[PDB]
């Protein structure tokens, strides 16, 4: 590959007829989009309390650093256009679990929360009822404008 291909199908390859490899040498690739943030407990499928999974357990995201740009990026990732608002409090529910203190610093111009610069080290504790939420527009054709 030249690195600029859209799919591996477009990559030129060099097959070898002889033996290839052993299964003890299979390749594994780690990409940067590992966030795994979803929307739960909403009337329409793609709005509700923001729920994030790290350390093998789901959790609710704090609203202290949940600006409208973070909501916009999350809505773009879930393919529901822009974010109408971020309802504070437990409008969609406090969530059965612990609160994740991740501080996403999205500028609102990226289409995935994994592209956002997230800071979670030593983040300040969050009140239980102060759980972040988002109400996406729901229109895929709707796009963010500056």
Max Cα-Cα span within the chain: 63
SS3 assignment, position 23:
helix
Q: Is 72 in the site for Ca ion (CB under 5 A)?
A: no
Query: Binder to Ca ion among 67, 73, 101, 135 (CB under 5 A)?
Result: 67
Kindly tell me which of 9 and 146 has the beta carbon lying closer to Ca ion: 146
Shortest Å, Cβ 59 to other proteins: 9
Query: Binder to other proteins among 74, 95, 101, 133 (CB under 8 A)?
Result: 101
Cα(58)–Cα(41) distance, rounded to whole angstroms? 14
Cα(132)–Cα(65) distance, rounded to whole angstroms? 9
Q: Is 124 in the site for other proteins (CB under 8 A)?
A: yes
DSSP 68: H
DSSP 110: -
Q: Is 102 in the site for other proteins (CB under 8 A)?
A: yes
SS3 assignment, position 139:
coil
Cα(129)–Cα(92) distance, rounded to whole angstroms? 11
Site string for other proteins, 61-100 (x = CB under 8 A): ---------------------------------------x
Only one of the segments 11-19, 63-71, 82-90, 127-135 lies at the binding site for other proteins (rule: CB under 8 A); that segment is 11-19
Site residues (vs Ca ion, CB under 5 A): 65, 67, 70
């Amino acid at each position: 590959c030249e690195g600029h291909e859209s799919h591996l199908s477009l990559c030129p390859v060099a097959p070898r007829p002889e033996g290839t490899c052993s299964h003890s040498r299979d390749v594994g690739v780690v990409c940067s989009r590992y966030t795994e943030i979803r929307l739960v407990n909403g009337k329409t499928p793609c709005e509700g309390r923001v729920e994030l999974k790290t350390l093998g357990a789901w959790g609710s995201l704090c609203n202290s650093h949940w600006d409208i740009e973070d909501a916009h990026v999350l809505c773009q990732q879930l393919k529901c256009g822009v974010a109408l608002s971020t309802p504070g409090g437990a409008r969609f529910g406090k969530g059965n679990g612990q609160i994740w203190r991740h501080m996403f610093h999205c500028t609102g111009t990226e289409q995935h929360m994994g592209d956002c610069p997230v800071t979670a080290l030593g983040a300040s504790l969050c009140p239980s009822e102060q759980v972040a939420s988002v109400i996406c527009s729901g229109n895929q054709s709707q796009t963010l404008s500056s």
